[PDB]
């Protein structure tokens, strides 16, 4: 029963040279790492080295053209970096961005391998830039390569093609890239909870709605839990897990659980507008630990309040280490629109999951 931790200060080198105050700050990962030390969680984890993802590994999910374009930014002049950035939705690029994206991907590969070989039971990856918005052919929403999707394929590549991977995406944004990459795949189950507001919340696509259940063989293996009607918090996320995430996950019976763990639904996030507490995230973590014989990898995605993300991810690691979950306040009355959301997801997926009937 060992917990791995991967963190490399080199991933701070990715920066926005046109707005040094952009919220995807290098200090996101250094502040999370610092808090793990202060709380004395770091000395209880087995440290896992970062490594560069290879170009071949990037090809598990991404087109050669997308790879070589991002690769080329490494030697671009500032004017070319600025032009290239404007060809994507919400992307800034510096000369170090490509290397940082490879470091984030490879760090998760080493973690998945450590888990799947039994060197550790579970693991946390404190990495940036994030991944879940990145598509097969394009970068998007602060993300260059889809770190979680690549780690799922990497895990299958060192075990077997049909390794059942669950990706739980609790970042406040829909992970459009992860959904699309696995949309017709029945070996990777994708479950996303996200602020939706009938398509008005980033990334502003109806792909995020509850009726997108997957395609062909992948029907039923894409689960969108969209929130409408303003602020959500622990009661709604607890109920989504109890009524949807955990019943479906148990029926799927993953052999590995990847968490796309953005912490931008946390209280205090300047962008998410939600109220999930660190104790809330501890409890979501604890529940997922009941799956896949405990084989859980937590991968940092978004999250923009330096204190909120540092307290929230620390609590998750605390859970992975075996600590007992902190008490929760008043989970009872959900917002009406959240009950409606959960009922829409239940109606969408009951055809595919007997546990929902």
Is 169 marked within a binding site? no
Which of Zn ion, ligand QQG, K ion, none sits in contact with 218, Cβ below 5 to 8 A by type? Answer: K ion
Q: Is 169 in the site for K ion (CB under 5 A)?
A: yes
The answer to whether residues 277 and 267 touch, using CB atoms and an 8 Å cutoff, is yes
Task: Quote the CA–CA distance of 166 and 288 in Å, as a whole number.
Answer: 10
Secondary structure (H, E, C), the chain: CCEEEEECHHHHHCCCCCCCCCCCCCHHHHHHHHHHHHCCCHHHCEECCCCCCCHHHHCCCCCHHHHHHHHHHHHCCHHHHHHHHCCCECCCCCCCHHHHHHHHHHHHHHHHHHHHCCCCCEEEEECCCCCCCCCCCCCECCECCCHHHHHHHHHHHHCCCCCCEEEEECCCCCCHHHHHHCCCCCCEEEEEEEECHHHCCCCCCHHHCCCCCCCHHHCCCEEEEEECCCCCCHHHHHHHHHHHHHHHHHHHCCCEEEEEECCCCECCCCCCCCCECHHHHHHHHHHHCCCHHHCEEEEECCCCCHHHHHHHHHHHHHHHCCCCCCCCCCCCCCCHHHHHHHHHHHHHHCCCCHHHC
- Candidate list 36, 133, 194, 286, residue with the active-site label: 133
Task: Out of 106, 213, 302, 341, point to the residue binding ligand QQG (CB under 6 A).
Answer: 302
Task: Out of 33, 98, 221, 281, point to the residue binding K ion (CB under 5 A).
Answer: 221
Which of Zn ion, ligand QQG, K ion, none sits in contact with 113, Cβ below 5 to 8 A by type? Answer: none
Buried b (16+ CB within 10 A) or exposed e, 242-265: ebbbbbbbeebebbbbbbbbbbbb
Residue 85 or 226 having the CB closest to K ion: 226
Task: Out of 192, 310, 314, 341, point to the residue binding K ion (CB under 5 A).
Answer: 192
Which of Zn ion, K ion, ligand QQG, none sits in contact with 169, Cβ below 5 to 8 A by type? Answer: K ion
Which of Zn ion, ligand QQG, K ion, none sits in contact with 192, Cβ below 5 to 8 A by type? Answer: K ion
String of contacts with ligand QQG for each residue 88-117, x by CB under 6 A: -xx---------------------------
Task: Out of 92, 202, 227, 252, point to the residue binding ligand QQG (CB under 6 A).
Answer: 202
Q: Which of residues 170-189 bind ligand QQG (CB under 6 A)?
A: 171, 173
Q: Is 235 in the site for ligand QQG (CB under 6 A)?
A: no
Active site residue 174: no
Residue 175 or 247 having the CB closest to K ion: 175
Shortest gap between Cβ of 240 and K ion (angstroms)? 11
Is 323 marked within a binding site? no
Q: Is 269 in the site for ligand QQG (CB under 6 A)?
A: no
Residues that bind Zn ion (CB under 5 A): 171, 173, 262, 264, 302
Q: Is 271 in the site for ligand QQG (CB under 6 A)?
A: yes
Shortest gap between Cβ of 237 and K ion (angstroms)? 11
Shortest gap between Cβ of 141 and Zn ion (angstroms)? 7
Q: Which residue is nearest to ligand QQG (CB)?
A: 302
Is 8 marked within a binding site? no
Vertex 335, ends 332 and 341: CA angle to 5°? 110
The answer to whether residues 275 and 267 touch, using CB atoms and an 8 Å cutoff, is yes
Please give the positions annotated as active site.
133
Report the interface residues with ligand QQG, using CB under 6 A: 89-90, 130, 133, 141-142, 171, 173, 202, 204, 262, 264, 271, 301-302
Binding residues for Zn(2+): 171, 173, 264
Report the interface residues with K ion, using CB under 5 A: 169, 171, 182, 185, 190, 192, 194, 218, 221-222
Binding residues: 171, 173, 264
């Amino acid at each position: 029963p060992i917990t791995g931790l991967v963190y490399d200060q080199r991933m701070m080198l990715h920066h926005n040279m046109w707005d040094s105050h952009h919220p995807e700050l290098p200090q996101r990962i250094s502040r999370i790492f610092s808090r793990h030390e202060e709380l004395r969680l770091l000395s209880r984890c087995h440290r896992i080295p970062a490594r560069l993802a290879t170009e071949e590994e990037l090809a598990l999910c991404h087109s050669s053209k997308h790879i070589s374009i991002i690769k080329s930014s490494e030697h671009m002049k500032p004017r070319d970096l600025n032009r290239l950035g404007d060809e994507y939705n919400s992307i800034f690029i510096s000369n170090e961005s490509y290397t940082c994206a490879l470091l984030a991907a490879g760090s998760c590969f080493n973690s998945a391998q450590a888990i799947l070989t039994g060197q550790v039971r579970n693991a946390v990856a404190i990495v940036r830039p994030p991944g879940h918005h990145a598509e097969k052919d394009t970068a998007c929403g602060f993300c260059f390569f889809n770190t979680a999707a690549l780690t799922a394929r990497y895990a299958q590549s060192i075990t077997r093609e049909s390794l059942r991977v669950l990706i739980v995406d609790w970042d406040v944004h829909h992970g459009n890239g992860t959904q699309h990459i696995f949309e017709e795949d029945d070996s990777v189950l994708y479950i996303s909870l996200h602020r939706y507001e009938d398509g008005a919340f980033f990334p502003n696509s109806e792909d995020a709605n509850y009726d997108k259940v997957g395609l062909g063989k992948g029907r039923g293996y894409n689960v969108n839990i969209p929130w409408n009607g303003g602020k959500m918090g622990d009661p709604e996320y607890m109920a989504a897990f109890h009524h949807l995430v955990m019943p479906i996950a148990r029926e799927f019976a993953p052999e590995l659980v990847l968490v796309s763990a953005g912490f931008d639904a946390a209280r205090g996030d300047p962008l998410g507008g939600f109220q999930v507490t660190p104790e809330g995230y501890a409890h979501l973590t604890h529940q997922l630990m009941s799956l896949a014989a405990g084989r859980v990898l937590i991968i940092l995605e978004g999250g923009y309040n330096l204190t909120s993300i540092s307290e929230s991810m620390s609590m998750c690691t605390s859970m992975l280490l075996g600590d007992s979950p902190p008490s929760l306040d008043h989970l009872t009355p959900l917002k009406t629109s959240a009950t409606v959301s959960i009922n829409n997801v239940l109606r969408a997926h009951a055809p595919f999951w007997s546990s929902l009937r």
